[PDB]
Design a protein around this ligand. Structure first.
Ligand SMILES: Cc1cc2nc3c(=O)[nH]c(=O)nc-3n(C[C@H](O)[C@H](O)[C@H](O)COP(=O)(O)OP(=O)(O)OC[C@H]3O[C@@H](n4cnc5c(N)ncnc54)[C@H](O)[C@@H]3O)c2cc1C
Ligand code: HEM
Ligand code: HEM
Ligand code: HEM
Ligand code: SF4
Ligand code: SF4
Ligand code: F3S
Ligand code: F3S
Ligand code: FES
Ligand code: NA
Lengths: 470, 114, 105, 238, 105, 119, 105, 114
């Protein structure tokens, strides 16, 4: 019964990393959908009091080799540099390609890009207080330029997963129409990001209902180190981890052994998509640099991905029954417990026992706390009976999303017997570099944890070992 | 619906209202000039009609509204010539002084009446 | 267009300013007006030409003025059209009456 | 503070147009809060409310609420400025907008009006520079008041001239965009935009109301745009 | 343009209708016209202003009328142009003669 | 011919109330037999400047077919040329029409709308 | 536009040519002009109407003429605008003075 | 800067210069007609003002410049009517004959003066 429309590219999120993706799919030409939750400019990216960072050449010399040196000494030598390779080699190109869009970046008296200093040793630029504001506004103005058809004020509740294990589209539930639709498309780029809503005091905004991990994990898509979580100095600010992917775009899964395999029909960029180029302390604006240049790569790497996987099928139109039965279960609850109290207790437990300090005894204590709360969560009452429109409805769904992210971080506190990078422990303050030189991995259906090895940056430069932090 | 602070609206409306009434003024004054100049037989007649206190009230109103219109018109003129600078304080001081000189020119009409 | 209107309004307001200055200045320096002096100050060239110029400029100015009013406020189209007709005939009748009353003296 | 609240209408789809139901809650005095916190606290008792909030820091024009008759940013405007001596704080939705939801009303007319100004650069293709654009910061120091219009629709709904003719005008910010893409020296397509704007009586429909500047949430100058663009346009078509 | 012409024709035809009504109505209620009564009914304001208005409106109307005729029928361009010149001078001479013959009485 | 700037208010099929179709039943069957066109007194003298009756039936069809939103550009493009008004309301063509179509109706509503715009 | 100006200039120059021919032809055939004959040759219809037509055409012609001069030479815009205002008031004052001096005889 | 052979420039400038002076001529002649016709009291007065040799110089100049303007205007008229053919010899012969008839019409003004 549900009306469906055939597409070649859909995007989960509108601005930040998403604007880039939809713009590159527009200049591709076939078709470029644009779904979101809020009107583009209202995206969290608009809070932008920190400038884009890319070396274009000051009065002095600045090479991409120094770029790699500083961006790796910052990351505390934990992740692979293939993505750092691509970043430090393609950044300037993309930033100047954006500067040709008339993007109002502040210049120097000669007429050249302005540059300022930050932590570590010579390029942390800035336009004004509103740098990313101008970034988003210019990407939106180019969206107008190429007439990309935005579908704003909607939601994505879950993705599609067939028998052979592919993704061929996404469902949607709106606020202007409020009726679920299905956009079927081989390319579904989860580029939304953010979860901090599950905590009390943080920098993030309330539109971040924590979905980029919600649909992923619920659909059964794995994740990499959902506990790499930076707390801006002492308020939480960033989710280093997120869905896995590569520099070219496609997400990754694992078999019963643990070998990384390309997932059919999924993509990811933006602060959600993690390649750990931010690590312990993100470089100033390397999530910004992520959403710009990694997204430019996600655009330039479209034909290479669609050619190997294409002309697939739907799960006999029987997988939309998954989210359909989720919404039916929504059509189940009449009374019970208010979801507000559930979220309250969860938030409390997590900010209590999974911030900078995670103490083993209290770690298992909060584990069983959040676990019993998860068990009892099923029967939740519903404050609004409205037929046409409300807010509460989406609020309801966001619970079944928010909590899930926290889960992963909690579990990972049982998988790291040291204080590695931002991750810190009272019972383990040091940083061992012999066992967990590799990423973590949360397997959804088994809810378990495993490891995933990392390369020692061989692309074009003789590698260097992890130095001592002194 | 209600905003309670239309400081500019009152200043502005007073322009089109005065224009709309002066547009019929000019016709009343064309009539008065016509009926007056025709001969002596009318002149005193005309002054006779310049006499009644209803008519005196009107004519003073005609000329007061005219003065308001002229002054606000000059403000629109000079302010758009670029000869006047833009800010809040300039706007409120222009309102003040224009209103004062409007009442001043009004008093001139009163002097004519008396 | 629109800048056409703008410029005509400003310019004809300039001529009107000069007029009202001169005319009500004569009212000022009246000093016991009389029929004799009244017809005196009117029968001139200067007064005659300046008054005809004034009425003509009032035509060309108030036309655009009421056009702006009746394109902003009175919404129905047949109404606004007939209303502008009434007002334009009012102005042209103003100027022609002016003729018959100044070039009769 | 233990407070009663009185709003326009908390559900539009109900048959009746007016609905001034009594909001009630008991709030504390020993901790300040902002209007959005009032919303947060209420939303669990009177369930049928709705609102469009984004950022809790007021940077993306989410909630430009016009309460009690005065507009402002809902994430800049606390409650004390509403609980003045007397009663009946008024936080009704915004003016002149379609009643499609309680407080997240439509802006299609507004955003479309912004759209009709072609708010984007255009280079015919000449490449006077090679690697990077050439612009003297003398521009940027006078461009710092155009590229932060957060589209909160405070000034647009607050222009007396724009009201009577909603479609024929262009609005203040719709002209801030034009001016931005005008005196940004990195373009050379002034004349076509100018004489396309010259045709419509939209530029001049302004009566120099100037109220919007005070009412602006960012403290932007649309009057300045209305000044220089009038000067230039006059200069062309004279 | 073309709607400009359309509206001017309709409106000035309205004024002309009112005129002919009034004027040939006076012819009706003549009742043994005399030189005395003839100059009587002309020397008024009302008659004077309404007749000048009539001739002016005939100008502004018949101009567009003959423009339409000579853009539909007379094909060669130099011809049609000089023909319109003759006809427009005819109309302006009509209105000026009207002047000299109504503001002489 | 139609033209959609690109908005997709619907998803699968267009949205139109048959109240249009019951008043659209007299435009989309012009069989181009050139009876009315050669039978218009106004059109003769100026063969190129005019637009003909059926040339206006097409305009009206693509006008009051609610499935478009590009009325103004076509209107003020037609407004420029004296072609719409070159008509003297001859009305003979209706009798002469082979299909029994109403061009006069088109000449009426399009004049009304055009007048409404450029007044 | 520009062809509008072109045609008005050529046509009104045609009327002006005919005028100067007729008027300075009368100067030629003067034969001991006198006050009597001077007022004689002016009080006519023909002379009156043709002189008013001449002054009107000089208006409509010299307007565009000085527009061309002051759009080619005087570069600053505020200057040129006020200059055209002075010159246009000069022409309209010319025609109105003409009135007061020909329809007084 | 200097070109030393502006044959057309002199012919052309003489058109706008004469126009600019005739534009004030027409005002001088409107004044003269006004002050003359008012009554007999002015006619001789007017002829009195037609008397001085400065004034006679002016009026002859008014009419000479007028004649130049008329003639060049006709050339612009006929040459653009297509009634005159284009070439160098036509241009120089038109210059010659127009200048001769300009001096001829000038002499007419001199005859009027005498
Ligand atoms: C003061 C300040 C300092 C900063 N410092 C740094 C720094 O040091 N380093 C750094 O890297 N960055 C920094 N940033 C940038 C910022 O913190 C983020 O890193 C960055 O904005 C991430 O943007 P994004 O494109 O990845 O996400 P976004 O573009 O915000 O992704 C969200 C998008 O998805 C949409 N969306 C929202 N909810 C949903 C939903 N439920 N389903 C689907 N779509 C949805 C949104 O509308 C939006 O389009 C700073 C920012 C500020 C304000
Ligand atoms: C004396 C008779 C006058 C008449 C009949 C007249 C006519 C009008 C009318 C009716 C209006 C309002 C309609 C409109 O234009 O929007 C108007 C506006 C205006 N008037 Fe006059 N006016 C007169 C005097 C003046 C004078 C002396 C000035 C001096 C500068 C002036 C300046 C203006 C200006 C600038 C406007 C446009 C401002 C606006 O839009 O309100 N007017 N005119
Ligand atoms: C009394 C002197 C009149 C003159 C000199 C005059 C002039 C003209 C002329 C010459 C035409 C034919 C040329 C043309 O327009 O196509 C015309 C058309 C027209 N006349 Fe008049 N007219 C007069 C009276 C009237 C009156 C009283 C009306 C009353 C309504 C009228 C209504 C029209 C209309 C509607 C047209 C256009 C119709 C068409 O195209 O034939 N006319 N006018
Ligand atoms: C008698 C009073 C006249 C006045 C006040 C007058 C006005 C002017 C003026 C001031 C100019 C120079 C400005 C310009 O148009 O570029 C001009 C140009 C011109 N005049 Fe006259 N003119 C008069 C007589 C004539 C006559 C009798 C003719 C006969 C054909 C004539 C033909 C022209 C032409 C063709 C031009 C345009 C050529 C050019 O651009 O120089 N003028 N007119
Ligand atoms: S008032 Fe200022 S901040 Fe608000 S929408 Fe208008 S331009 Fe933007
Ligand atoms: S007369 Fe009717 S059927 Fe014949 S061509 Fe014209 S529109 Fe078609
Ligand atoms: S339209 Fe009016 S409200 Fe201000 S910005 Fe212009 S004067
Ligand atoms: S052009 Fe004439 S023939 Fe009929 S369709 Fe129109 S009235
Ligand atoms: S909440 Fe986003 S602007 Fe105030
Ligand atoms: Na993440």
């Amino acid at each position: 019964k549900l009306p469906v429309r055939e597409f070649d590219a859909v995007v989960i999120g509108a601005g930040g990393a998403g604007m880039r993706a939809a713009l590159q799919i527009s200049q591709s030409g076939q078709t470029c959908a644009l779904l979101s939750k809020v009107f583009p400019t209202r995206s969290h990216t608009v809070s932008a009091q920190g400038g884009i960072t890319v070396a274009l050449g000051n009065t002095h010399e600045d090479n991409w080799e120094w770029h790699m040196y500083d961006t790796v000494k910052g990351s505390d030598y934990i992740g692979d540099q293939d993505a750092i390779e691509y970043m430090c080699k393609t950044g300037p190109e993309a930033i100047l390609e954006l500067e040709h869009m008339g993007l109002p970046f502040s210049r120097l008296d000669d007429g050249r890009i302005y540059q300022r200093p930050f932590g570590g040793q010579a390029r942390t630029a800035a336009a004004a207080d509103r740098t990313g504001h101008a970034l988003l506004h210019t990407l939106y103005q180019q969206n107008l330029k190429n007439h990309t058809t935005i579908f704003s004020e909607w939601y994505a509740l879950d993705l599609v997963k067939n028998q052979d294990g592919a993704v061929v589209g996404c469902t949607a539930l709106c606020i202007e129409t409020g009726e679920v639709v299905y956009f079927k498309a081989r390319a579904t780029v989860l580029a939304t990001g953010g979860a901090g809503r599950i905590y009390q005091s943080t920098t993030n905004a309330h539109i971040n209902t924590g979905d980029g991990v919600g649909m992923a994990i619920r659909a059964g898509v794995p994740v990499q180190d959902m506990e790499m979580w930076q707390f801006h100095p002492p308020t939480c600010h960033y989710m280093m981890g997120g869905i896995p992917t590569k520099v070219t775009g496609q997400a990754l899964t694992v078999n019963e052994k643990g070998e990384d395999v390309v997932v059919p029909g999924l993509f990811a960029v933006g602060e959600i998509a993690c390649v750990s180029v931010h690590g312990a302390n993100r470089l100033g604006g390397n999530s910004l640099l992520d959403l710009v240049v990694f997204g430019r790569a996600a655009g330039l790497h479209l034909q290479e991905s669609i050619a190997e996987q294409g002309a697939l099928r739907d799960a006999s139109e029987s997988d939309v029954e998954a989210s359909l039965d989720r919404l039916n279960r929504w059509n189940n609850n009449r009374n019970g417990e208010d979801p507000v109290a559930i979220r309250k207790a969860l938030q409390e437990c997590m900010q209590h026992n999974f911030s900078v300090f995670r103490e083993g005894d209290a770690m298992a204590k909060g584990l069983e706390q959040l676990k019993v709360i998860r068990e009892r969560l099923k029967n939740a009452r519903l404050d609004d009976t409205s037929s046409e429109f409300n807010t509460q409805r989406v609020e309801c769904l966001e619970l079944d999303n928010l909590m899930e992210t926290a889960y992963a971080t909690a579990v990972s506190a049982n998988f790291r017997t040291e204080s590695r990078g931002a991750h810190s422990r009272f019972d383990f303050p040091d940083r061992d570099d012999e066992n967990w030189l590799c990423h973590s991995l949360y397997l959804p259906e088994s809810e378990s944890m495993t490891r995933r090895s990392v390369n020692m940056e061989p692309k074009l430069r003789p590698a260097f070992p992890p130095k001592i932090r002194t | 619906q209600t905003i309670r602070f239309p400081i500019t609206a009152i200043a502005s409306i007073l322009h089109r209202v005065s224009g709309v009434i002066t547009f019929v003024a000019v016709g009343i004054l064309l009539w008065l000039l016509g009926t007056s100049l025709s001969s002596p037989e009318g002149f005193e007649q005309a002054s006779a009609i310049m006499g009644s206190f209803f008519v005196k009230f009107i004519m003073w109103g005609i000329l007061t509204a005219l003065a308001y219109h002229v002054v606000v018109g000059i403000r629109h003129m000079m302010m758009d010539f670029g000869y006047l600078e833009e800010t809040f304080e300039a706007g409120k001081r222009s309102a003040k002084i224009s209103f004062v000189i409007t009442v001043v020119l009004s008093l001139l009409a009163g002097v004519l009446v008396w | 267009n629109g800048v056409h209107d703008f410029i005509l309004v400003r310019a004809t307001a300039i001529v009107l300013t000069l007029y009202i200055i001169y005319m009500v200045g004569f009212f000022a320096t009246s000093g016991e007006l009389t029929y004799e002096v009244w017809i005196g100050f009117f029968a001139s060239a200067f007064t005659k030409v300046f008054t005809l110029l004034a009425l003509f400029s009032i035509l060309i100015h108030a036309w655009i003025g009421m056009w702006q009013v009746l394109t902003d406020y009175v919404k129905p189209l047949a109404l606004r059209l007939m209303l502008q007709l009434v007002i334009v005939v009012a102005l042209v009748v103003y100027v022609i009456y002016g003729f018959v009353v100044v070039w009769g003296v | 503070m233990r407070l009663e609240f009185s709003i326009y209408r908390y559900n539009p789809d109900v048959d009746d147009a007016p609905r001034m139901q009594d909001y009630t809650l008991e709030a504390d005095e020993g901790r300040d809060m902002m209007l959005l916190d009032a919303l947060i606290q209420l939303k669990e008792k009177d369930p049928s409310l709705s609102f469009r909030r984004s950022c809790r820091e007021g940077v993306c024009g989410s909630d430009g609420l016009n309460m009690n008759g005065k507009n402002g940013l809902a994430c800049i405007t606390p409650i004390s400025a509403l609980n003045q001596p007397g009663k009946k704080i008024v936080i009704r939705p915004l003016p002149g907008l379609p009643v499609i939801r309680d407080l997240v009303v439509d802006m299609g007319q507004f955003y479309a009006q912004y759209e009709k100004i072609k708010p984007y650069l255009l280079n015919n293709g000449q490449n006077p520079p090679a690697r990077e654009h050439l612009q003297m910061p003398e521009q940027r120091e006078k461009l710092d008041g155009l590229y932060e219009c957060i589209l909160c629709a405070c000034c647009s709904t607050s222009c007396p001239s724009f009201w009577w003719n909603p479609d024929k005008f262009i609005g203040p910010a719709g002209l801030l965009a034009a001016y931005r893409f005008l005196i940004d020296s990195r373009d050379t397509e002034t004349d076509s935009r100018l004489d396309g704007l010259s045709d419509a009586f939209s530029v001049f429909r302004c009566h120099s109301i100037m109220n919007c500047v005070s009412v602006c949430p960012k403290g932007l100058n649309p009057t300045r745009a209305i000044g220089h663009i009038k000067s230039m346009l006059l200069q062309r078509n004279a």
